[PDB]
Every structure is written in C-alpha cells, then in structure tokens.
Design a protein around this nucleic acid. Structure first.
Ligand SMILES: [Cl-]
Ligand SMILES: [Cl-]
Ligand SMILES: [Cl-]
Ligand SMILES: [Cl-]
Ligand SMILES: [Cl-]
Ligand SMILES: [Cl-]
Ligand SMILES: [Cl-]
Ligand SMILES: [Cl-]
Ligand SMILES: [Cl-]
Ligand SMILES: [Mg+2]
Ligand SMILES: [Mg+2]
Ligand SMILES: [Mg+2]
Ligand SMILES: [Mg+2]
Ligand SMILES: [Mg+2]
Ligand SMILES: [Mg+2]
Ligand SMILES: [Mg+2]
Ligand SMILES: [Mg+2]
Ligand SMILES: [Mg+2]
Ligand SMILES: [Mg+2]
Ligand SMILES: [Mg+2]
Ligand SMILES: [Mg+2]
Ligand SMILES: [Mg+2]
Ligand SMILES: [Mg+2]
Ligand SMILES: [Mg+2]
Ligand SMILES: [Mg+2]
Ligand code: NA
Ligand code: NA
Ligand code: NA
Ligand code: NA
Ligand code: NA
Ligand code: NA
Ligand code: NA
Ligand code: NA
Ligand code: NA
Ligand code: NA
Ligand code: NA
Ligand code: NA
Ligand code: NA
Ligand code: NA
Lengths: 144, 144, 150, 49
RNA sequence: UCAGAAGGGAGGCGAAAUAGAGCAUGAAAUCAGUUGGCGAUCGAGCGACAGGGCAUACAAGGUCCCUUGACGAAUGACCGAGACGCGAGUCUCCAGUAAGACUCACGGGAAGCCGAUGUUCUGUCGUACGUUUUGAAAAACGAGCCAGGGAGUGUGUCUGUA
RNA sequence: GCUCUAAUUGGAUGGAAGCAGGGGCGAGAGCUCCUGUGGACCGAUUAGUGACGAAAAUCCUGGCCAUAGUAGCAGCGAUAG
C-alpha cells in the first residue's frame, strides 16, 4: 500500500545545448516580485501590478529600494520563455483527441482541472502509451 | 569591575594619547579581540589645559530630564571616548564595546603593551594633561 | 453560534456549551484563561471565591483603569466578575453532570479546552443631548468547554 | 428618471460631511450613491442598426 | 441536566445538519483558542535586493552542496632576479602567465535536502500613497479598517483617418 | 481582464462556478495546476456587444476593530431609608 503516480513522471525533454543553457540562465537569474507599490502597507491594496503613476512616487522615480518597475529589459530569453521548469513546452489537454500531434520528446501535457476522473483515466493511459508525460498525474494505491 | 576580565590584549595607556589609543582599541574590538586598557589615569591629552578642561566641563554641565550622563572619572572618560568610535547601538558594535574594559591602574599581573604611534614624549612636550588631572578638576573622587 | 473548535475523544472527554449569554465578553475571556487546566471541582471552588470576593480574576488584556490586586500573582490588575462567573458555574454544572451520566468522575476531570466567543450584540439606543441617539449594546457570548480524563 | 425621484439636497460645508445630496439622512441621486442614478446608462434613442 | 415549552449533553433523520429554521455557497475587515517565528537593553514608511537562522505530510516545482578537471571575456598578480628613487615606492623580466564570472564532465554527498512559503537576523538603499505646488515626509489637502458601489455616454451636424 | 450575442468547438455529479491554502508560467495586465470546501453549472477560438477594470473624491451603503469595561447611571432646597 503506497501512492504512485500514473505515467512517465521522470521523463525529461531533449534540449539543444543552447536551449538548456538559456533554461539554466532563466532559472539562475530569475526576477523581482514585481508586486504593486505599497501593497504591503494597506490591505485594500493587492499585489497585482499597477504602474506607479504618482508624480512624487518614489518607485516611479526609480529610487533604489522601492522596487523595480516593469520594463522590457526584464523579459526571459525567447528560446526558453514559457517553458515548464523541466524544460518541456506545456500543452493543455481537455480530452483524448487533444493528445494528437503532441511530441512527448519536447512536450508534456497538462490536463485541465475541470476534466473529471473518468476522462482523466483514459487520457492518462493514452498519454503514457504515446510517450507523453502528464505534469498533473493521478496518484493511485499500489503495493509496497 | 573587579571581575577578572580575560583579555587577548592588555594596553598600557600611560603617557599615551587617548584618542590614538581609542581608535586602535576600537578597531581591534571590532576585529574580535577582547581588550583591557590599563593605567587610564596616566593617559594623556595634548593641548592647552584650560580649553581642554572647559570642553569636558561643558559635557558635565549639559543635560536635561532625558539626560546626558557624562563620566567624571578617568576610566569612564576613556570608555566613552572608545564608544564614540564604535557603532555601539548596532549589535556587532555593542558586542565589541562590551569586549573592552578600562582600568584605573593595573589589576593584571603582567604589564601592558604600548601601541605604536600612541606614545607621548614628555621631554618634547609641555602642553598636555593627564586624564587623572581632568577628573580631579571635574570633581571626581581620586581613588588612584 | 460556535461549534467546538477543538477535536475531542468521546471516550475520554465530556462537553458543554453556553449560548448567547448576555454578559461581558471581556470578563468571559479573562475567566476562561484562568480556569483552563484546572480540575472541574477546582474551577468551581475558584469561581465561588471570585463571587465572594476572596479570589481576584486577573485582567491581563482588558485592564484599562483597573486597580491592582495583591492576590494576583505574576500580574497586577484583577477583578471579581460575578455575573460571568455565575454563568461559568452553570457551564461547569452541565459539563460535570454530562460527565457523571457517562460514567466518568466529573469533578476530577481536567478542563482541556475553555473559550469564549462573541457571537453578537443585542442592540439598543441611548438618547443623548442635542437631539441625537447613540448605541447602547449588550454583548452575546457562546462558550465551549471540553472536560478530559487525567 | 431612475434615481432622480427625490428632492435630496446637499447640506454643504459645516457638518464634517462630504457635500452629497441627502434625504432623511441617506445619500441620493448622484452616481456614487447607492440608489443614485446611472451616470452613462444604455439609452433607447441609440441607433443600434 | 436545568428554575426551565430556554440552553447544554446524549441520541434520531438525511447524500449532507459545518443543510437545524433570516437554515445554498459563506470572502475581507475582525474576535476567541491555538501553531510556527521573534520577544521584557532597546528605535520608528513597516519594504526592495542580497545573504544567514529556525519552521515545513503528500500533491501541483526538482533541484542543490563539496573535491578535482575542461572552457575561460574584461581584468590581472605574489614570490624571485636585475636596475632606479632621499623616501613612501617604482621600472624590466618572470607574463597577458597563475588567477578570472557563467557553463559543463568525472567522482562524492544532501531529502527540511534545493527551490518555494512563514517568521526573524545581518548588509545596502529607503522620511507612505494620491493631490495641490516653483518646491510635499511635510507643521499644505484627503482617508479609522474591509467588502460591495462609484466618473468620456446618446442624438444631430461638421471635419479628418483606417 | 469583465458581461452578454453569434459561429466553430470542448469540460462537468467519476464533481462545474465560487471560496481558502498551496505549486508552475508570463517583464506585466494576468494565465494555469494541486489540495480542501462547495454541490450545479462552466469554458476556448473567432467575430461582435457594453451599465467593462478603483486606494483616493470631508466619495455612497453595509459591516467591523481600537477607543473601553472608559464617560454617564452623583450635583437640582425633594440627600431616604
Ligand atoms: Cl515584448
Ligand atoms: Cl543630565
Ligand atoms: Cl550605532
Ligand atoms: Cl609643548
Ligand atoms: Cl466586547
Ligand atoms: Cl482581561
Ligand atoms: Cl551561460
Ligand atoms: Cl570536461
Ligand atoms: Cl475618454
Ligand atoms: Mg511575481
Ligand atoms: Mg495589501
Ligand atoms: Mg479534475
Ligand atoms: Mg487532478
Ligand atoms: Mg481606575
Ligand atoms: Mg429634544
Ligand atoms: Mg438604481
Ligand atoms: Mg450557510
Ligand atoms: Mg533580554
Ligand atoms: Mg506656494
Ligand atoms: Mg468594485
Ligand atoms: Mg473556433
Ligand atoms: Mg487614483
Ligand atoms: Mg461608514
Ligand atoms: Mg481613556
Ligand atoms: Mg435626609
Ligand atoms: Na588633543
Ligand atoms: Na552631563
Ligand atoms: Na491591555
Ligand atoms: Na501581583
Ligand atoms: Na501576589
Ligand atoms: Na421619491
Ligand atoms: Na433607437
Ligand atoms: Na529565511
Ligand atoms: Na489637493
Ligand atoms: Na505626498
Ligand atoms: Na513642513
Ligand atoms: Na468611528
Ligand atoms: Na464606469
Ligand atoms: Na467623514
């Protein structure tokens, strides 16, 4: 009696040397939180980013320590942008037909939360057979 | 007070310039060393006795309800002089400062060492005062 | 109202509640704090002394202007809130009775959990000068008690 | 006429209150008021063809 | 059980009673109890960024440490030898050498482990926000807090544009 | 990013929306997954539609904390037990 995930959970994509380097860079450099100015000072102000507009705003004026402001210089490398940490490109899947055309070498599949257990069971078996990792696998009871 | 301080360094302030010693004792204490300054009463301040005395008298004089508590005795004065060379409100600063103690006379068995650059030549100088003298003028009880 | 906020083993524990009591919530908080960990019987004896004025209840939170009391230990302010105390005595009488009916020894059981909760206000208005009225309100208090065998 | 049927008036300065039309101590008519009018509502005269 | 048609306990119904009567769901402000972190010698835009400590069920992230080696931009030596300077020191050669951020490979290691999250500590920077203003942290104006509400719309005509 | 319309096309009692806590992506607006709760609805693409996005207006309404167990429950030629 132990929990085990369905499918190929250890599968990793094959990446060109330069893509793996850029993936490593993205992970290494990261980025600031880019939370809205003073969101921590007022409960009614949430973290969702808004450009500081105040004429006198310290953050708008670029005062060191008031947080970076969103700017294009902060974008991730083109080659790797949007990749799952594993390096796979994600493909969203609502059913069995959605698996068609998916390359399990460069792509992993994410089953939409709305999809129920019955349809999930079928999607997961077909995906394994096609050599495609499921990022959000069911965990089933199996022996120790 | 009589507590038997264990010092990595014992400094003899006899015929030495207070601020030049203090500057060096400050830096050593921040460097991790425990320091005992010895014979504080015989430590020395260059210049005209009358203006020197006015300055220290002004410090005894100034104050209010919040309070400015300025030491009259030679050990106290030396201690305070050192505190001024430490970030004594920050943690590393208060730690260094508490690793320093100043003594009237020499409670140790061994003579202290004379730090380079701190020694005053009495044959070359008549304009200076001993801490002991300042304290007596300030009205300190002379226990040394 | 409240539900029990702590889990309790039916076999080793007994339960009781007060509902919507009109009495100081602040006094109730102070009393709960003080009787937790006591034996049911101990708590009863304590509260009766409070009612007599022999035992102060420490007020550690709602202390404004409250005079110091020599019998308070490790603290200064205390008082003798008999009304809330009487209600806690009702709470304990129920709990210990429930316990006895289950075959425990009621008085000897430890108070594992005791907590007061302000569940509402009974609302009133007080006419003031200059043609205005202002709130004159009654707190409403639930309190949960879980007795547990030693 | 939704939100406009009321002779609510503002007290102006001096009560420590914003200048907002009130009737029987409740704000009325202005678009920031609950029960107030819709500032720029859908209109029948609009040509939708 | 209780002064009790109250309330409580136990129990019954139902898929569900945390559907038990203003009873679907049940946010925030906020309250009680409790958990983690800090804590009665210490300083205040509450943080950003970097780095420590303590804390962490699974899932949805899987990385990370150390020795050695490969590659190696800008930059770039010690010591030693020769020569110069009153002196601090400098020049020439060793040498664009050793070193040099990232990345990778072999071997070894970590599973509260790496990330991340909570809290706290250290470093650097930092006197909110919005508005008025030549100049706002302002002893200029506004808000107790939170939720919800709250401001370029229609007709006609004219003039451009795609 | 929000509403509702249309065409094309999907998900849901083998558990939709919402909510709480958490994981991943995006410079970001925001997208998405897991767990719990919930117990019936929900999307995507394209072309439309508009009562479409709030930290502020002594803004509106409702709820709520501190204030605080504080002021008052004394004062009056009727001090009443
Ligand atoms: Cl872009
Ligand atoms: Cl003083
Ligand atoms: Cl300091
Ligand atoms: Cl001289
Ligand atoms: Cl209260
Ligand atoms: Cl209290
Ligand atoms: Cl690289
Ligand atoms: Cl290699
Ligand atoms: Cl506009
Ligand atoms: Mg972010
Ligand atoms: Mg906030
Ligand atoms: Mg699902
Ligand atoms: Mg799933
Ligand atoms: Mg008082
Ligand atoms: Mg009147
Ligand atoms: Mg209306
Ligand atoms: Mg409900
Ligand atoms: Mg302490
Ligand atoms: Mg002016
Ligand atoms: Mg809104
Ligand atoms: Mg389509
Ligand atoms: Mg604004
Ligand atoms: Mg209000
Ligand atoms: Mg007061
Ligand atoms: Mg009388
Ligand atoms: Na001097
Ligand atoms: Na003084
Ligand atoms: Na208090
Ligand atoms: Na005491
Ligand atoms: Na005492
Ligand atoms: Na009317
Ligand atoms: Na029309
Ligand atoms: Na930390
Ligand atoms: Na203004
Ligand atoms: Na301002
Ligand atoms: Na000012
Ligand atoms: Na108020
Ligand atoms: Na609007
Ligand atoms: Na107001």
């Amino acid at each position: 009696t132990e929990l085990q995930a369905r499918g190929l959970t250890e599968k990793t994509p094959d990446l060109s040397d330069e893509d793996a380097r850029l993936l490593t860079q993205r992970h290494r450099v990261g980025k600031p939180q880019f939370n809205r100015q003073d969101h921590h000072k007022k409960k009614r102000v949430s973290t969702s980013w808004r450009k500081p507009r105040g004429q006198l705003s310290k953050q708008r004026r670029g005062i060191k320590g008031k947080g970076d402001t969103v700017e294009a210089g902060f974008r991730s490398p083109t080659a790797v942008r949007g990749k799952h940490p594993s390096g796979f490109e994600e493909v969203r899947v609502h059913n069995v037909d959605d698996l068609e055309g998916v390359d399990g070498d460069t792509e992993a599949v994410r089953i939409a939360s709305k999809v129920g257990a019955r349809k999930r069971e079928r999607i997961e078996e077909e995906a394994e057979d096609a050599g495609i990792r499921v990022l959000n696998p069911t965990y089933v009871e199996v022996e120790v | 007070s009589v507590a038997e301080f264990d010092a990595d360094v014992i400094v003899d302030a006899r015929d030495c310039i207070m601020g030049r010693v203090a500057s060096q004792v400050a830096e050593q204490a921040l460097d991790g060393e425990t320091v005992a300054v010895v014979n504080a009463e015989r430590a020395v301040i260059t210049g005209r006795e009358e203006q020197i005395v006015e300055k220290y008298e002004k410090r005894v004089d100034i104050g209010n309800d919040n309070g400015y508590f300025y030491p009259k005795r030679p050990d106290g004065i030396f201690k305070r002089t050192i505190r001024g060379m430490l970030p004594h409100k920050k943690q590393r600063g208060r730690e260094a400062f508490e690793s320093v103690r100043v003594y009237l006379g020499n409670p140790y068995d061994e003579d202290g060492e004379v730090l380079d650059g701190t020694s005053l030549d009495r044959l070359s100088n008549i304009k200076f005062v001993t801490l002991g003298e300042i304290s007596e003028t300030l009205g300190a009880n002379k226990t040394w | 109202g409240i539900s029990y906020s702590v889990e309790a083993d039916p076999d080793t524990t007994a339960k009781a509640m007060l509902r919507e009591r009109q009495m100081s919530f602040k006094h109730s908080k102070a009393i709960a704090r003080e009787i937790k960990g006591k034996t049911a019987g101990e708590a009863v004896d304590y509260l009766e002394a409070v009612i007599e004025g022999d035992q102060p209840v420490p007020f550690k939170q709602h202390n404004s202007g409250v005079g110091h009391k020599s019998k308070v230990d490790g603290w200064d302010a205390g008082r003798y809130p008999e009304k809330a105390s009487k209600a806690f005595l009702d709470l304990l009488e129920n709990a210990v009775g429930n316990a006895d009916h289950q075959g425990f020894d009621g008085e000897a059981m430890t108070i594992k959990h005791v907590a007061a909760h302000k569940v509402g206000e009974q609302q009133g208005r007080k006419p003031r000068a200059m043609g205005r009225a202002s709130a004159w309100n009654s707190p409403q208090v639930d309190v949960e008690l879980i007795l547990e065998e030693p | 006429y939704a939100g406009l049927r009321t002779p609510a008036e503002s007290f102006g300065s001096g009560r420590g209150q914003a200048h907002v039309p009130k009737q029987d101590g409740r704000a009325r008519r202005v678009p920031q008021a609950v029960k107030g009018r819709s500032a720029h509502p859908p209109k029948t005269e609009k040509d939708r063809s």
